[PDB]
Design an enzyme around this catalytic site. Structure first.
Site, PDB file in Angstrom:
ATOM      1  N   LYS A  51       0.818  -1.211   0.000  1.00 14.74           N
ATOM      2  CA  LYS A  51       0.000   0.000   0.000  1.00 14.74           C
ATOM      3  C   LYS A  51       0.857   1.269   0.000  1.00 14.74           C
ATOM      4  O   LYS A  51       0.382   2.352  -0.342  1.00 14.74           O
ATOM      5  CB  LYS A  51      -0.950   0.004   1.202  1.00 14.74           C
ATOM      6  CG  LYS A  51      -2.034   1.070   1.125  1.00 14.74           C
ATOM      7  CD  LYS A  51      -2.859   1.143   2.398  1.00 14.74           C
ATOM      8  CE  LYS A  51      -3.900   2.248   2.302  1.00 14.74           C
ATOM      9  NZ  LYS A  51      -3.271   3.566   2.001  1.00 14.74           N
ATOM     10  N   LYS A  63      -6.629  -7.452  -0.971  1.00 17.45           N
ATOM     11  CA  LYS A  63      -6.568  -8.590  -1.878  1.00 17.45           C
ATOM     12  C   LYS A  63      -5.206  -9.273  -1.813  1.00 17.45           C
ATOM     13  O   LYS A  63      -5.108 -10.498  -1.886  1.00 17.45           O
ATOM     14  CB  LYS A  63      -6.868  -8.154  -3.312  1.00 17.45           C
ATOM     15  CG  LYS A  63      -8.327  -7.810  -3.557  1.00 17.45           C
ATOM     16  CD  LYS A  63      -8.542  -7.213  -4.939  1.00 17.45           C
ATOM     17  CE  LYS A  63     -10.012  -7.253  -5.326  1.00 17.45           C
ATOM     18  NZ  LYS A  63     -10.829  -6.321  -4.502  1.00 17.45           N
ATOM     19  N   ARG A 140       4.438 -15.340 -29.043  1.00 10.36           N
ATOM     20  CA  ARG A 140       5.379 -14.237 -28.964  1.00 10.36           C
ATOM     21  C   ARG A 140       6.462 -14.399 -30.022  1.00 10.36           C
ATOM     22  O   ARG A 140       6.687 -15.496 -30.533  1.00 10.36           O
ATOM     23  CB  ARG A 140       5.993 -14.153 -27.566  1.00 10.36           C
ATOM     24  CG  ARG A 140       4.957 -14.048 -26.457  1.00 10.36           C
ATOM     25  CD  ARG A 140       5.590 -13.713 -25.114  1.00 10.36           C
ATOM     26  NE  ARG A 140       6.388 -12.492 -25.177  1.00 10.36           N
ATOM     27  CZ  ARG A 140       5.881 -11.264 -25.125  1.00 10.36           C
ATOM     28  NH1 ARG A 140       4.572 -11.089 -25.017  1.00 10.36           N
ATOM     29  NH2 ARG A 140       6.686 -10.212 -25.189  1.00 10.36           N
ATOM     30  N   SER A 171       8.198  -2.708 -27.964  1.00  6.70           N
ATOM     31  CA  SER A 171       9.014  -3.499 -27.047  1.00  6.70           C
ATOM     32  C   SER A 171      10.377  -3.878 -27.631  1.00  6.70           C
ATOM     33  O   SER A 171      11.326  -4.115 -26.885  1.00  6.70           O
ATOM     34  CB  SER A 171       8.258  -4.762 -26.629  1.00  6.70           C
ATOM     35  OG  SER A 171       7.968  -5.576 -27.752  1.00  6.70           O
ATOM     36  N   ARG A 174      12.798  -1.254 -26.883  1.00  4.78           N
ATOM     37  CA  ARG A 174      13.061  -1.288 -25.448  1.00  4.78           C
ATOM     38  C   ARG A 174      13.958  -2.467 -25.073  1.00  4.78           C
ATOM     39  O   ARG A 174      14.228  -2.699 -23.895  1.00  4.78           O
ATOM     40  CB  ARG A 174      11.754  -1.353 -24.654  1.00  4.78           C
ATOM     41  CG  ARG A 174      10.856  -0.137 -24.820  1.00  4.78           C
ATOM     42  CD  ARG A 174       9.861  -0.025 -23.673  1.00  4.78           C
ATOM     43  NE  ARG A 174       9.140  -1.275 -23.437  1.00  4.78           N
ATOM     44  CZ  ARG A 174       8.049  -1.644 -24.098  1.00  4.78           C
ATOM     45  NH1 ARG A 174       7.547  -0.863 -25.043  1.00  4.78           N
ATOM     46  NH2 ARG A 174       7.457  -2.799 -23.818  1.00  4.78           N
ATOM     47  N   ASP A 181       4.396  -8.182 -31.033  1.00  2.00           N
ATOM     48  CA  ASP A 181       4.235  -7.865 -32.447  1.00  2.00           C
ATOM     49  C   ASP A 181       5.364  -6.968 -32.950  1.00  2.00           C
ATOM     50  O   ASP A 181       6.332  -6.716 -32.235  1.00  2.00           O
ATOM     51  CB  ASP A 181       2.874  -7.202 -32.700  1.00  2.00           C
ATOM     52  CG  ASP A 181       2.709  -5.876 -31.967  1.00  2.00           C
ATOM     53  OD1 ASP A 181       3.698  -5.346 -31.420  1.00  2.00           O
ATOM     54  OD2 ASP A 181       1.574  -5.354 -31.942  1.00  2.00           O
TER      55      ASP A 181
HETATM   56  N1  0KX Z   1      -2.671   1.947 -24.874  1.00  2.00           N
HETATM   57  C1  0KX Z   1      -1.578   2.114 -25.618  1.00  2.00           C
HETATM   58  C2  0KX Z   1      -1.090   1.063 -26.419  1.00  2.00           C
HETATM   59  C3  0KX Z   1       0.094   1.304 -27.116  1.00  2.00           C
HETATM   60  N2  0KX Z   1       0.737   2.552 -27.081  1.00  2.00           N
HETATM   61  C4  0KX Z   1       2.024   2.727 -27.848  1.00  2.00           C
HETATM   62  C5  0KX Z   1       3.203   2.387 -26.884  1.00  2.00           C
HETATM   63  C6  0KX Z   1       3.585   0.969 -27.288  1.00  2.00           C
HETATM   64  O1  0KX Z   1       4.921   0.531 -26.855  1.00  2.00           O
HETATM   65  C7  0KX Z   1       3.376   1.071 -28.818  1.00  2.00           C
HETATM   66  C8  0KX Z   1       3.056  -0.285 -29.503  1.00  2.00           C
HETATM   67  O2  0KX Z   1       1.931  -0.917 -28.866  1.00  2.00           O
HETATM   68  P1  0KX Z   1       2.063  -2.515 -28.633  1.00  2.00           P
HETATM   69  O3  0KX Z   1       2.558  -3.246 -29.846  1.00  2.00           O
HETATM   70  O4  0KX Z   1       0.571  -2.885 -28.293  1.00  2.00           O
HETATM   71  N3  0KX Z   1       2.907  -2.655 -27.146  1.00  2.00           N
HETATM   72  P2  0KX Z   1       4.513  -2.976 -27.120  1.00  2.00           P
HETATM   73  O5  0KX Z   1       5.221  -3.020 -28.410  1.00  2.00           O
HETATM   74  O6  0KX Z   1       5.152  -2.061 -25.987  1.00  2.00           O
HETATM   75  O7  0KX Z   1       4.682  -4.454 -26.451  1.00  2.00           O
HETATM   76  P3  0KX Z   1       4.313  -5.840 -27.159  1.00  2.00           P
HETATM   77  O8  0KX Z   1       3.147  -6.543 -26.582  1.00  2.00           O
HETATM   78  O9  0KX Z   1       3.947  -5.475 -28.692  1.00  2.00           O
HETATM   79  O10 0KX Z   1       5.578  -6.714 -27.103  1.00  2.00           O
HETATM   80  O11 0KX Z   1       2.194   1.839 -28.999  1.00  2.00           O
HETATM   81  C9  0KX Z   1       0.253   3.560 -26.313  1.00  2.00           C
HETATM   82  O12 0KX Z   1       0.815   4.673 -26.216  1.00  2.00           O
HETATM   83  N4  0KX Z   1      -0.906   3.335 -25.514  1.00  2.00           N
HETATM   84 MG    MG Z   2       1.469  -3.188 -31.845  1.00  2.00          MG
HETATM   85 MG    MG Z   3       4.436  -4.077 -30.034  1.00  2.00          MG
HETATM   86 NA    NA Z   4      -0.447   3.726  -2.234  1.00  2.00          NA
END
Ligand code: 0KX
Ligand code: MG
Ligand code: MG
Ligand code: NA
Ligand code: NA
Length: 326
Positions: A51, A63, A140, A171, A174, A181
DNA sequence: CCGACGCGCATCAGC
DNA sequence: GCTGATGCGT
DNA sequence: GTCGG
């Protein structure tokens, strides 16, 4: 993953509120809590300890105490046994099927994978492709394959126009060892915040990637955003690679840094950063960072010459892409 | 307490 | 056809 | 569901 059991629980609760309850702020509340706990560098002993973290309140602390004591959550156990919730949660796993459409399908007695496959005519285009590759989109992508895909996309793009620049974000940028994807940021000097001196800039890239049979399907497509499907080619007698989701985003060349910040993510990192920007009196989108007037109306775009500049405006120390995985 | 919680494309209603 | 809301997604 | 005002 010192607290994997806890963050899993919260994620499942988050998905419940999103898909079944249709309560988007609870969804975001649980995901924020799961995120802050995920990076907490201790094995959590109690809800009180949790918390103390920003995003964890009284209800989640309780929870966590139940979970630590028993290894489960009665609330989740009940949700799992509910037929309607389980049906809705399943259907929403198909791309294009959201909470509204899922609940609608369930009302019409369409609630299993098999039901979907005999009722293709009731699906819009996005949903039909989502069903088609339902299994593949679950998988993945190893970073090794991401590198192959990067190589293909980047050179097919060069072949269309040597002045295109394609940057793989999400990702991958990163530094993830596997991605859900592929996310591609695209620029061309003909398309700036000032003008568009050339039509079909995104189209021509999509077209080319289709020609070499990399892109196999299209979920949606506009002037600036493409959402679709791709597949690596396989060698002789080799089993085929899974089909993969690919997103391509064309962004004005002069607004690259705001764009690459956005598309690098993570989604929760972006939410936190943009929220912090608001607290600091700015607003950030994929194009610009703008000041807020006392009124609460955005001002003019501020000068940006690096990702770091955006961090500077809101008084954040710079964080490399690999430290933005929240 | 209580207000607020960070834009692209597909689809549809209403005119 | 255009405009604005809603769904779904990034 | 949580937090700052
Ligand atoms: N709600 C969201 C969804 C995505 N995005 C942006 C940031 C993400 O890194 C980018 C690509 O979305 P993504 O493919 O769904 N996620 P990301 O590549 O980080 O991880 P993965 O699940 O694809 O490995 O779009 C955003 O700003 N707000
Ligand atoms: Mg995407
Ligand atoms: Mg992605
Ligand atoms: Na908190
Ligand atoms: Na879905």
């Amino acid at each position: 993953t010192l607290n994997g059991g806890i963050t899993d629980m919260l994620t499942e609760l988050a998905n419940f509120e999103k898909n079944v309850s249709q309560a988007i702020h609870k969804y975001n509340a649980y995901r924020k809590a799961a995120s802050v706990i995920a990076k907490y560098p201790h094995k959590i002993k109690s809800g009180a300890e949790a918390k103390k973290l920003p995003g964890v309140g009284t209800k989640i602390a309780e929870k966590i105490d139940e979970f630590l004591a028993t290894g489960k959550l009665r609330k989740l156990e009940k949700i799992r046994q509910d037929d309607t919730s389980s049906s809705i949660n399943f259907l929403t796993r198909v791309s294009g099927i959201g909470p509204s459409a899922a609940r609608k399908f369930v009302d019409e007695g369409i609630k299993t994978l098999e039901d979907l496959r005999k009722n293709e005519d009731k699906l819009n285009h996005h949903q039909r492709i989502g069903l088609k590759y339902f299994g593949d989109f679950e998988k993945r992508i190893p970073r090794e394959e991401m590198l192959q895909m990067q190589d293909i996309v980047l050179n097919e793009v060069k072949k269309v126009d040597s002045e295109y620049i394609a940057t793989v974000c999400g990702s991958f940028r990163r530094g993830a060892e596997s991605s859900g994807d592929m996310d591609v940021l695209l620029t061309h000097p003909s398309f700036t915040s000032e003008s568009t001196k050339q039509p079909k800039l995104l189209h021509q890239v999509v077209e080319q990637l289709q020609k070499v049979h990399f892109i196999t399907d299209t979920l949606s497509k506009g002037e600036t955003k493409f959402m679709g499907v791709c597949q690596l080619p396989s060698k002789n007698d080799e089993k085929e690679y899974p089909h993969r989701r690919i997103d391509i985003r064309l962004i004005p060349k002069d607004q690259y840094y705001c764009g690459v910040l956005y598309f690098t993510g993570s989604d929760i990192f972006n939410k936190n950063m943009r929220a912090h920007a608001l607290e600091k009196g700015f607003t950030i989108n994929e194009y610009t960072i703008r000041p807020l007037g006392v009124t609460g109306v955005a001002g003019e775009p501020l000068p940006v010459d690096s990702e770091k500049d955006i961090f500077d405006y809101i008084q954040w120390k710079y964080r490399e892409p690999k430290d933005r995985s929240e």
